[PDB]
Scaffold this active site. Structure first.
Site, short mmCIF file in Angstrom:
data_model
loop_
_atom_site.label_atom_id
_atom_site.label_comp_id
_atom_site.label_asym_id
_atom_site.label_seq_id
_atom_site.Cartn_x
_atom_site.Cartn_y
_atom_site.Cartn_z
N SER C 197 22.48 27.87 -14.92
CA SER C 197 23.15 28.05 -13.63
C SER C 197 22.47 29.13 -12.80
O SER C 197 21.39 28.89 -12.28
CB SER C 197 24.65 28.35 -13.83
OG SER C 197 25.36 28.49 -12.60
N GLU C 324 27.02 17.55 -12.93
CA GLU C 324 27.01 18.96 -12.57
C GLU C 324 28.13 19.33 -11.60
O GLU C 324 28.58 20.47 -11.58
CB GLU C 324 25.67 19.32 -11.93
CG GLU C 324 24.44 19.10 -12.80
CD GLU C 324 24.17 20.23 -13.77
OE1 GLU C 324 24.94 21.21 -13.83
OE2 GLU C 324 23.16 20.14 -14.47
N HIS C 437 28.74 20.98 -16.24
CA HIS C 437 27.87 22.09 -15.89
C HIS C 437 28.03 23.15 -16.99
O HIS C 437 29.15 23.57 -17.31
CB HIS C 437 28.33 22.65 -14.54
CG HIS C 437 27.52 23.80 -14.03
ND1 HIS C 437 26.37 23.63 -13.29
CD2 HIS C 437 27.74 25.13 -14.08
CE1 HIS C 437 25.92 24.81 -12.90
NE2 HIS C 437 26.73 25.74 -13.36
#
Ligand SMILES: *[C@@H]1O[C@H](CO)[C@@H](O)[C@H](O)[C@H]1NC(C)=O
Ligand SMILES: *[C@@H]1O[C@H](CO)[C@@H](O)[C@H](O)[C@H]1NC(C)=O
Ligand SMILES: [Zn+2]
Ligand SMILES: [Zn+2]
Ligand SMILES: [Zn+2]
Ligand SMILES: [Zn+2]
Lengths: 61, 532, 532, 61
Positions: C197, C324, C437
């Site tokens: 991330s 995601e 995610h």
């Protein structure tokens, strides 16, 4: 040499061109349309696209 | 007798044409206008001065001066659309097939031929109405109208070359069918016009024009529409093309009178040779002389007429074919050919894409490319061929028709939509061309009922079902027979948007004909181009 | 002994942590910077002044002051990401797992945690490196860095609150790993940074910054990128947000010194409460304080750096997850919910679509809508949910990563791309959220090897294959073992664009990861927005 | 009434609110984030969205 022959207001016939060339005059840019055929090989410009061929038969299709 | 009918303009005599087992009456060649020769070239039509004696309406009339497409010399797929009769400036005629014995008052169907407004002939074998008129027992008329410069040279302002002359020819044909069709056994009150390609656009242009609204009850538009990108031009664009036609023949362009008089001195042969020079761009599915939004024949802009509602409010039965763009790709689009499977390369797709939509800007062309491209296979010759086939059909026929449907349905008195997707079993065109532009007419006109034509049993049934829908719609104003049969062709509505396919398989009712693509063409792209 | 290592800044002592069957050495809590407390808040880090005696590196360090997400109170899917240690301004520490017996000179992998730059903790159970370090026998370091205002308040110009402070914290951690990692058995020359991330964006921001290029050999970016829309802000935007944070606490905004001094007097508790006010818009996947393109840490605009080539030229192994955008839809997007199948209505899709892309204009939003809509079923709750799930993932992660890949590969020294699409068998998140995610980290860190975690046999193999690719890539600079095994992970090339999926099924090599959608996001939309 | 309780820097605990209400203060506009819970029912503005509920238990989730 057996070749097609006609104009913009005529249907294509198959006349005999001698030892002479057969053309296929068209509109160079799309729509590239046939505007004439027969024996010979006239000049053209950016707009016209003459396509002369002496062989084989029906070569100006 | 039956072959003798007195019309308002004189007595007419037809013949017994053999239709399958029976026979039928046919009046081939009835004049509805004074031959637009002499100074009459380019001008508005005139009524046919009444004759003395019996007119001989037994042989097919003359075809109008136009271009002959010898693209594929001797190809029956192309040559069958070329004028089969003699071309001539004296071509404004009409044909009538009357069910024998003559009916008292039956439904009348008037056919308006297509040809991009530069060609056309009511005398084609695919326009032979003895089968439809005989089968559904309806009087069937097929009109004539000037094409090209002869019927569409348009110098707005001048009275000798106004513009919508080709449509004025059709309207005169309709007014004759209005006055006289009762004497042949037809109901002037239940008359429905129907046509393909440019004829359908004409049917649509008659539904919009005030002076043509009270000459027909219903209508049918096959693969065409008044708002099609190729169907009309401004009063300026048409004027540009008139002048261009002039300088191409070495005319005095000082004024309209000097230009128009010059073009009239020219043999009709001469006008047709320099006619394609009239095309300003470099593209696909774009013609020379087409109707102009006059502000006379067409009050305001077609779109304005569609929005406000300014148009005849009756029921319509309209539709399209699966592959409308195919044929149009054979005239210059790189990679295409009748003799191959025309697999297109990425770079040739981009080239063709630029040709299909000659009005879009680079960002619009990026918009078109991104929409019709498989980025996971941007080099697949089949996908590139098809996405290019789809760009011509949607932009040029399918979407402009879906735009007309929605607008009209807001003020329409009922609407039916079809999607003809059957490929003729005896088709002489290349497999990759699919269900071609104009290849439904033979189902509408009943050709497949003729054993000598080599169609299949299931194909005769499809033509019979299509002939029936067409006729029943003409009479009833609804394709579906009341309390009879089971198949129910859904009335198109702006809400559910139902339509049906037309193939040799069960009646399948679909919804939203090419909506993702037509949202792109109708709504999005227009927005993009204006914001840029 | 082995648990005793003398570093450049003092002597350190760790402990024997049990790893599966064996055990491993771990130095938890090594200070790499002076606790950024006092006036040191907001400022650039300072090196940790050398200590006298043996430092006790056996217990996990403090976590950094940040927001705790009690969105789903007590939900193990969310709470497992919240800081597990004690939060505190004195949080700049690092942890090291050394394979026992200590190696002479082995590969070093440095982990940089994610959290949208407002959260993060190197001490999570999914960030536990004893399994990876022990399994591949590599020294594994996981750093710390200030998040939120504490590490990213950025008033360009001022020296007490410059900006990229959180990244400066990471760089200080890397410089310690550069100087001292040899004394633990690690090769300072074969060190590769990797993060998820925001950490991946950091890895990318270290590959672009000059002062960080010579502190690592290779790199890995998991679901993140320096050019991600949410990763950076101008020196003006960040300044706007600094001032906003100030007026939200009733500070003197007359000047930087007066603003900055004020925010420093506030309890860290106070800054976190008014931190989300910093969000100027109204959207999804957009945070508060993020790095600023300084013109110092980041020479020019990231794009400029990508184009010209201005960036460290080594090999990278990067990638993304299937879904995601899912998690990001649970914080306001109408119709979404962890407890339902979140079927979205057309009107709620349009609402969410406006939230996912807070920068686009109406025509751009029409462009987004038309792209992610099934017009043949614009009311299907599943398709609307998914097309909305896809809008957040592509725009916010997948495309910005594919844009970085292509640019980098033009000057890269080898590139590998993956697409992790396996859904954990023991996942506590709702079925509709897909491969979430951050849900790959547990495969990278070997958690699935722990029987007590309840994974499947095939899942241990996947984590082993992923751990191996990661480690082998760190050493070799190529995931693929030479003359060993058969599975060949294709080197990504700008031409063929090959990549592979990461699931519990055979090694499948695909090409062009989300190209149609990323052409829309990367190339087209940017063009549209500028032409408008 | 058993309800959740915490701040922006605290983990949610389940304290007992008496016959009093339990709130769930959040950021009104997306990202609609919980910024606090507990017993009571404070005022708010366009930015804050306090959500008070007296039943059942864990009603301020
Ligand atoms: C006109 O009618 C006559 C009468 O039978 C017919 O023989 C003739 O073919 C028709 N027209 C022409 C041009 O021959
Ligand atoms: C520090 O090391 C000692 C030595 O074993 C250990 O007992 C202790 O747990 C470590 N730290 C703390 C805060 O207890
Ligand atoms: Zn007159
Ligand atoms: Zn080439
Ligand atoms: Zn210093
Ligand atoms: Zn509603």
């Amino acid at each position: 040499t057996m070749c097609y022959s006609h104009t913009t207001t005529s249907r294509a016939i198959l006349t005999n061109c001698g030892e002479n060339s057969c053309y296929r005059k068209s509109r160079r840019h799309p729509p590239k349309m046939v505007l004439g055929r027969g024996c010979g090989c006239p000049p053209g410009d950016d707009n016209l696209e003459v396509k002369c061929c002496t062989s084989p038969d029906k070569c100006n299709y | 007798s039956e072959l003798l009918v007195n019309t308002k303009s004189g007595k007419v005599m037809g013949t017994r044409v053999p239709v399958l087992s029976s026979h039928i009456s046919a009046f081939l060649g009835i004049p509805f206008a004074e031959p637009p020769v002499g100074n009459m070239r380019f001008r508005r039509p005139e009524p046919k001065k009444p004759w003395s004696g019996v007119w001989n309406a037994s042989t097919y009339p003359n075809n109008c001066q136009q271009y002959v497409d010898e693209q594929f010399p001797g190809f029956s797929g192309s040559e069958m659309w070329n004028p089969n009769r003699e071309m001539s400036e004296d071509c404004l005629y009409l044909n009538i097939w009357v069910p024998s014995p003559r009916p008292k008052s039956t439904t009348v169907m008037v056919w308006i031929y297509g040809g991009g407004f530069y060609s056309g002939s009511s005398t084609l074998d695919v326009y032979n109405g003895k089968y439809l008129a005989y089968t559904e027992e309806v009087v069937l008329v097929s009109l004539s109208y000037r094409v090209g410069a002869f019927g569409f040279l348009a110098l707005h302002g001048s009275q000798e070359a106004p513009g919508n002359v080709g449509l004025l020819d059709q309207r005169m044909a309709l007014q004759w069918v209005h006055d006289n069709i009762q004497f042949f056994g037809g109901d002037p009150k239940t008359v429905t016009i129907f046509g393909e390609s440019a004829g359908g656009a004409s049917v649509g242009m008659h539904i919009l024009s005030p002076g043509s609204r009270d000459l027909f009850r219903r209508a049918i538009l096959q693969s065409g529409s008044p708002n099609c990108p190729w169907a009309s031009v401004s009063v300026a664009e048409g004027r540009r093309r008139a002048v261009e036609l002039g300088r191409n023949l070495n005319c005095n362009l000082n004024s309209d009178e000097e230009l128009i008089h010059c073009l009239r001195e020219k043999k009709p042969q001469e006008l047709i040779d320099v006619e394609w020079n009239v095309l300003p761009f470099d593209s696909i599915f774009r013609f020379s002389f087409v109707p102009v939004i006059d502000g006379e024949f067409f009050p305001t802009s077609l779109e304005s007429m569609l929005n406000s509602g300014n148009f005849k409010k009756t029921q319509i039965l309209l539709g399209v074919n699966k592959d409308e763009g195919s044929f149009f790709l054979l005239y210059g689009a790189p990679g295409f050919s009748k003799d191959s499977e025309s697999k297109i390369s990425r770079e040739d797709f981009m080239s063709g894409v630029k040709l299909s939509v000659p009005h879009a800007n680079d960002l619009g062309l990026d918009a078109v490319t991104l929409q019709y491209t498989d980025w996971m296979d941007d080099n697949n010759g089949i996908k590139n061929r098809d996405g290019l086939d789809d760009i011509v059909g949607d932009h040029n026929v399918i979407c402009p028709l879906m735009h007309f449907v929605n607008k009209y349905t807001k003020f329409g008195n009922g609407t039916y939509l079809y999607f003809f997707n059957h490929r003729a079993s005896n088709l002489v065109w290349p497999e990759w061309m699919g269900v071609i532009h104009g290849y439904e007419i033979e189902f509408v006109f009943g050709l497949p009922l003729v054993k000598e034509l080599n169609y299949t049993a299931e194909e005769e049934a499809l033509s019979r079902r299509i002939m029936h829908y067409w006729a029943t719609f003409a009479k009833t104003g609804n394709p579906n027979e009341p309390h009879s049969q089971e198949s129910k062709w859904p009335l198109f509505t702006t809400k559910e948007q139902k339509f049906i396919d037309l193939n040799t398989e069960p009646m399948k009712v679909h919804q939203r004909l090419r909506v993702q693509m037509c949202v792109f063409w109708n709504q999005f792209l227009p927005k993009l181009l204006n914001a840029t």
